[PDB]
Amino acid sequence: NQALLRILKETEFKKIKVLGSGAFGTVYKGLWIPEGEKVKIPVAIKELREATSPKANKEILDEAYVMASVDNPHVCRLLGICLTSTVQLIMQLMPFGCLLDYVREHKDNIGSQYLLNWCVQIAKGMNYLEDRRLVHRDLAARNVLVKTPQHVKITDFGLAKLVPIKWMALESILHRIYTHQSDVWSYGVTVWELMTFGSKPYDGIPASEISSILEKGERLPQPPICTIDVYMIMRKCWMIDADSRPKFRELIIEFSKMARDPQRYLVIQGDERMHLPSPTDSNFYRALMDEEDM
Amino acid sequence: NQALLRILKETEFKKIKVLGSGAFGTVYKGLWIPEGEKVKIPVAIKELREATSPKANKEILDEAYVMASVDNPHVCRLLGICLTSTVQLIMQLMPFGCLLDYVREHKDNIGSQYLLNWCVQIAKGMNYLEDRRLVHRDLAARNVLVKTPQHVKITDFGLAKVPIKWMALESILHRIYTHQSDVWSYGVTVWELMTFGSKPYDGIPASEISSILEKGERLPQPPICTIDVYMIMRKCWMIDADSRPKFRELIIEFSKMARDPQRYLVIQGDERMHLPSPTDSNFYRALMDEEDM
Numbered sequence: 167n168q169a170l171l172r173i174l175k176e177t178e179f180k181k182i183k184v185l186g187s188g189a190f191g192t193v194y195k196g197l198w199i200p201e202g203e204k205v206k207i208p209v210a211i212k213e214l215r216e217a218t219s220p221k222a223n224k225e226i227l228d229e230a231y232v233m234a235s236v237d238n239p240h241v242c243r244l245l246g247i248c249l250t251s252t253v254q255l256i257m258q259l260m261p262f263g264c265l266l267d268y269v270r271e272h273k274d275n276i277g278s279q280y281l282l283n284w285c286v287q288i289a290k291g292m293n294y295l296e297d298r299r300l301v302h303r304d305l306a307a308r309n310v311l312v313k314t315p316q317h318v319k320i321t322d323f324g325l326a327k328l329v330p331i332k333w334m335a336l337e338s339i340l341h342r343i344y345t346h347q348s349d350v351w352s353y354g355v356t357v358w359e360l361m362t363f364g365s366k367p368y369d370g371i372p373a374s375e376i377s378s379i380l381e382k383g384e385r386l387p388q389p390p391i392c393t394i395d396v397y398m399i400m401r402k403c404w405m406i407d408a409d410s411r412p413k414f415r416e417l418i419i420e421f422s423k424m425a426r427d428p429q430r431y432l433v434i435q436g437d438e439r440m441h442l443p444s445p446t447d448s449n450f451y452r453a454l455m456d457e458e459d460m
Numbered sequence: 461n462q463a464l465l466r467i468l469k470e471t472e473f474k475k476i477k478v479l480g481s482g483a484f485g486t487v488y489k490g491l492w493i494p495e496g497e498k499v500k501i502p503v504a505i506k507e508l509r510e511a512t513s514p515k516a517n518k519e520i521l522d523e524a525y526v527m528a529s530v531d532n533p534h535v536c537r538l539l540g541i542c543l544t545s546t547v548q549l550i551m552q553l554m555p556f557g558c559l560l561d562y563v564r565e566h567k568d569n570i571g572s573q574y575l576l577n578w579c580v581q582i583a584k585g586m587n588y589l590e591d592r593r594l595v596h597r598d599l600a601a602r603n604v605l606v607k608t609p610q611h612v613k614i615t616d617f618g619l620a621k622v623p624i625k626w627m628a629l630e631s632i633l634h635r636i637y638t639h640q641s642d643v644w645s646y647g648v649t650v651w652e653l654m655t656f657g658s659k660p661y662d663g664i665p666a667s668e669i670s671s672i673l674e675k676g677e678r679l680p681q682p683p684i685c686t687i688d689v690y691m692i693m694r695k696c697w698m699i700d701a702d703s704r705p706k707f708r709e710l711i712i713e714f715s716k717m718a719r720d721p722q723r724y725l726v727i728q729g730d731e732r733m734h735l736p737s738p739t740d741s742n743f744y745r746a747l748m749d750e751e752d753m
């Protein structure tokens with residue numbers, strides 16, 4: 167339990183390059199230098215923007231231990247932490263980056279089999295979090311990391327103590343209610359991001375006005391590639407009654423069914439000239455970059 | 461089977477830095493660039509020196525398919541091959557490098573628990589090769605790679621198609637390579653570790669090694685070894701190959717000693733060096749070593 171989170175010294179790692187920032191901190195590509203060794207191991211470091219105290223660090227560590235305890239192929243695990251004035255968190259470096267930027271950059275080369283399997287994998291990761299009784303609270307295409315093109319993992323979950331209005335359920339925007347069913351709403355928006363190849367939700371609508379349009383029944387529009395089958399699932403994630411939305415267990419089953427006949431459910435120009443990697447290319451990826459069980 | 465070896469194009473990988481030289485080639489640090497992608501993935505690439513032909517490239521492929529088929533935590537797997545003028549072989553990059561240089565560079569910080577566990581892991585990999593009926597033929601501290609300090613893996617095995625001072629007497633005299641002649645090389649490999657990377661028979665010409673072996677000379681007892689460990693090494697160097705221990709037996713014996721390491725190795729400073737905590741091991745595995753055992 168306690169051994170799943172490594173406490174690092176300042177002197178055993180170095181930030182080398184800025185990767186981006188968001189709302190809670192700046193993420194760096196970094197290097198871990200094991201004591202007494204000559205190797206340099208790449209890591210990802212998030213330095214929280216707000217400085218904290220030793221007593222606030224007790225809060226940080228209590229949540230850090232929980233996020234260091236996850237064990238699922240599609241959920242990222244927090245690996246380490248270094249406390250000072252500013253808190254630095256350490257996890258595995260994902261060279262492919264986040265799924266949002268990945269789909270924007272590869273939008274003319276992503277076929278139906280990839281998109282639906284990513285939907286399955288995110289639902290598998292979310293179902294694990296629900297099983298562990300951990301609410302994500304910030305699910306979005308930007309918080310799905312690409313380990314390999316065939317394998318995505320959820321990150322930045324459970325930040326209860328630390329707003330993405332356009333990804334939040336109506337009950338979260340108004341009354342600050344965060345449940346696994348409000349995550350299902352965020353899952354719907356994330357799927358919309360993938361199927362629009364990285365479009366911005368409610369583009370040009372100020373965040374302060376999102377709750378009004380949701381109450382009047384407006385929802386994100388049907389993406390051009392989505393059949394009605396897929397759009398019905400997205401819409402059901404955005405029902406105003408949280409208990410009427412699908413469960414992550416059901417989303418796994420439904421998207422897995424569609425993944426077994428992907429061109430029936432997504433209409434993409436060029437779909438027959440793109441496929442999943444052959445077993446050869448998957449074995450090569452996994453041996454070099456992805457040796458975990460699944 | 462066939463899908464375990466990836467055939468790469470010249471245009472999808474690049475050699476960036478020379479790491480050293482091995483069997484039949486120079487091993488380089490490389491980068492794999494997946495087609496249609498922007499990432500660069502580090503690999504280790506060996507470009508065969510004596511260049512080859514398309515008909516000869518078939519012999520290479522038949523052996524490559526077997527070395528791409530190994531599935532054991534302590535045995536390195538061949539991942540890819542690029543059939544160019546010179547044939548280049550692709551596998552996972554081990555930033556820690558080989559165990560021989562590692563023990564030389566960390567010789568004042570390596571405790572008994574690491575040394576005995578390294579012996580266990582090499583024996584596990586060699587027992588695997590025996591189970592697959594693959595004779596290594598070149599086992600040595602140089603052909604044991606460090607994935608993490610806690611996890612070593614055997615490489616460059618099965619190159620049937622000379623390391624005299626690691627060879628069993630029957631290999632030197634008669635070119636007989638069996639799993640029992642590997643046991644001899646394993647004994648020498650353990651000797652390299654326990655001496656913190658000393659050269660075996662230092663200063664004796666290779667052309668005279670078989671003579672000294674026939675007269676009964678063997679590598680001397682390393683200073684840190686108790687007699688229990690040295691007796692095992694000596695039993696690996698018996699002239700009767702069938703009298704040498706089996707890798708299955710070496711696993712059991714070294715694992716027993718690994719459960720009480722300071723009883724079997726006497727190292728100055730041993731009580732101030734230990735294995736990594738579960739904390740440090742989980743950190744290593746998540747970053748560098750996500751494979752099972």
Ligand SMILES: O=C(Nc1nccs1)[C@@H](c1cc(F)ccc1O)N1Cc2ccc(-c3ccc(N4CCNCC4)cc3)cc2C1=O
Binds near residue numbers: 229255
């Ligand atoms: O480190 C993460 N990302 C990374 N990106 C790149 C490199 S590291 C993710 C993260 C990474 C994962 F891999 C998996 C889950 C996860 O959540 N974390 C972890 C984390 C732990 C604790 C806290 C925390 C708790 C309390 C407080 N307050 C309370 C009120 N005022 C005083 C102090 C502030 C911050 C935040 C986070 C966080 O953002």
Ligand SMILES: O=C(Nc1nccs1)[C@@H](c1cc(F)ccc1O)N1Cc2ccc(-c3ccc(N4CCNCC4)cc3)cc2C1=O
Binds near residue numbers: 619
């Ligand atoms: O690639 C390896 N090392 C690496 N270092 C760094 C990056 S890759 C290991 C290696 C890697 C493993 F993962 C496991 C075992 C192993 O041996 N190989 C593999 C290999 C395959 C084939 C051949 C081969 C066979 C026959 C011929 N003849 C045929 C008849 N006409 C004349 C020429 C030439 C070359 C050699 C090797 C070899 O040296």
Ligand SMILES: Nc1ncnc2c1ncn2[C@@H]1O[C@H](COP(=O)(O)OP(=O)(O)NP(=O)(O)O)[C@@H](O)[C@H]1O
Binds near residue numbers: 210261304311
């Ligand atoms: N382990 C990682 N490896 C590589 N890039 C990462 C990693 N973790 C996060 N990033 C990226 O680093 C950038 C900045 O991180 P972050 O501060 O979380 O921004 P963000 O995720 O887009 N905003 P947020 O909604 O709070 O998660 C984003 O592009 C992340 O996708």
Ligand SMILES: *CCC(=O)N[C@@H]1CN(c2nc(Nc3cn(C)nc3OC)c3ncn(C)c3n2)C[C@H]1F
Binds near residue numbers: 486554555559561
């Ligand atoms: C110890 C004997 C030796 O040097 N053999 C050479 C190098 N080998 C080798 N090395 C690595 N990793 C490595 C070595 N150095 C100096 N830096 C690195 O990593 C950046 C390696 N990874 C995978 N393979 C197959 C390797 N081989 C073997 C001989 F080339």
Ligand SMILES: [Mg+2]
Binds near residue numbers: 188309321322
């Ligand atoms: Mg994030």
